[PDB]
Amino acid sequence: SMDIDPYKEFGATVELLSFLPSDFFPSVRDLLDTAAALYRDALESPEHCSPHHTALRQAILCWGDLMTLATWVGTNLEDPASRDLVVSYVNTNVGLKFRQLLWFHISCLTFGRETVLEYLVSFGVWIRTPPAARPPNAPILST
Amino acid sequence: SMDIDPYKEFGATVELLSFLPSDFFPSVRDLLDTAAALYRDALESPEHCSPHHTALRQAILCWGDLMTLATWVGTNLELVVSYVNTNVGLKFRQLLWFHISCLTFGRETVLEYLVSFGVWIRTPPAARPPNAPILST
Numbered sequence A: 001s002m003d004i005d006p007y008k009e010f011g012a013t014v015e016l017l018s019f020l021p022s023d024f025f026p027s028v029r030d031l032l033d034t035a036a037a038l039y040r041d042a043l044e045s046p047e048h049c050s051p052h053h054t055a056l057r058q059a060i061l062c063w064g065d066l067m068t069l070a071t072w073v074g075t076n077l078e079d080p081a082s083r084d085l086v087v088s089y090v091n092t093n094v095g096l097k098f099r100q101l102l103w104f105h106i107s108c109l110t111f112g113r114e115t116v117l118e119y120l121v122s123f124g125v126w127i128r129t130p131p132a133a134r135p136p137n138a139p140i141l142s143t
Numbered sequence B: 001s002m003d004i005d006p007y008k009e010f011g012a013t014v015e016l017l018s019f020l021p022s023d024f025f026p027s028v029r030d031l032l033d034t035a036a037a038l039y040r041d042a043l044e045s046p047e048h049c050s051p052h053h054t055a056l057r058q059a060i061l062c063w064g065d066l067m068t069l070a071t072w073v074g075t076n077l078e079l080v081v082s083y084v085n086t087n088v089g090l091k092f093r094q095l096l097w098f099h100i101s102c103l104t105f106g107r108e109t110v111l112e113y114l115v116s117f118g119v120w121i122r123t124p125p126a127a128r129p130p131n132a133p134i135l136s137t
């Protein structure tokens, strides 16, 4: 009966990240490509660097495990579309969680946590303003 | 792809933990229970506390997502649960044990114990002392 919030220690919460709609978040493919492109040397490094790095390290690997289970279904699980349904669960339902988690951490390193959090409410408020009055410019993430 | 080692930032490797045999590690139920008993308050806290705390936090939750998925397949299809607890179980048993033990007794102590144990257990019956080396504060 323990309840740990992956975001608590970084000044956010699961409720908060779910304020951004599903379709705001980049893909997992695109997210890992970006972590590598901007951070491989630090993630692969033997320094802590930041708490963010530590967490990101763990989430890439954890997504890894979920993906190596997804490959293992089929190549070991005999039945046909009862195999596809599992790999479909993995890539859409859990994938959303990790899309949230990875975004949060790459975006925090790239842009700074306090800037990430402000952009988060600002986009959530903005996107929910209906088209009728919602400005052309969604707010921006920068630095 | 990049090759990240979850142990590297704490001065060990996946290789080095595999030195300890499968049956050295407690069960996951037993590991999570100890995490809670010894650390619930720090793990649920809003401070980082330490890199070990940060990583362990993520591992518990990760194991949780795998259980979540495992409970899901049983009720949404008709096992896959064989693989989750046999193959993947061990990896999290290693990772959970490593971080809990590092916080409990100290990284450098854990690493000394880990080599001394792997050597000791490999010394065959005929000559292995009956008393294994000890892990303690």
Ligand SMILES: Cn1cnc(COC(=O)N[C@H]2CCc3c(C(=O)Nc4ccc(F)c(Cl)c4)ccc(F)c32)n1
Binding pocket: A125, A126, A128, A129, A130, A133, A134, A135, A137, A139
């Ligand atoms: C050039 N510049 C300087 N500052 C800015 C930022 O501007 C915006 O994007 N404004 C947005 C804010 C939300 C909103 C609403 C609104 O009422 N939104 C809303 C949506 C959902 C809610 F739940 C609530 Cl309470 C309010 C109506 C009109 C708006 F223009 C805006 N640009």
Ligand SMILES: Cn1cnc(COC(=O)N[C@H]2CCc3c(C(=O)Nc4ccc(F)c(Cl)c4)ccc(F)c32)n1
Binding pocket: A026, A030, A031, A034, A035, A102, A103, A106, A107, A110, A139, A140, A141, A142, A143
């Ligand atoms: C002064 N100024 C004017 N424009 C700018 C820069 O504007 C951009 O084009 N910013 C982009 C960068 C990505 C991003 C995201 C985002 O979510 N990015 C993201 C973060 C982490 C990731 F891993 C990935 Cl794959 C994407 C959300 C909103 C954005 F506006 C922007 N400065």
Ligand SMILES: Cn1cnc(COC(=O)N[C@H]2CCc3c(C(=O)Nc4ccc(F)c(Cl)c4)ccc(F)c32)n1
Binding pocket: B026, B030, B031, B034, B035, B096, B097, B100, B101, B133, B134, B135, B136
């Ligand atoms: C001379 N002396 C001084 N103290 C003592 C008595 O100490 C013990 O009985 N040590 C035990 C403590 C647990 C443990 C483990 C272990 O790794 N346990 C473990 C670690 C982390 C966990 F999360 C869990 Cl559930 C179990 C491995 C070897 C051990 F010897 C001991 N004699």
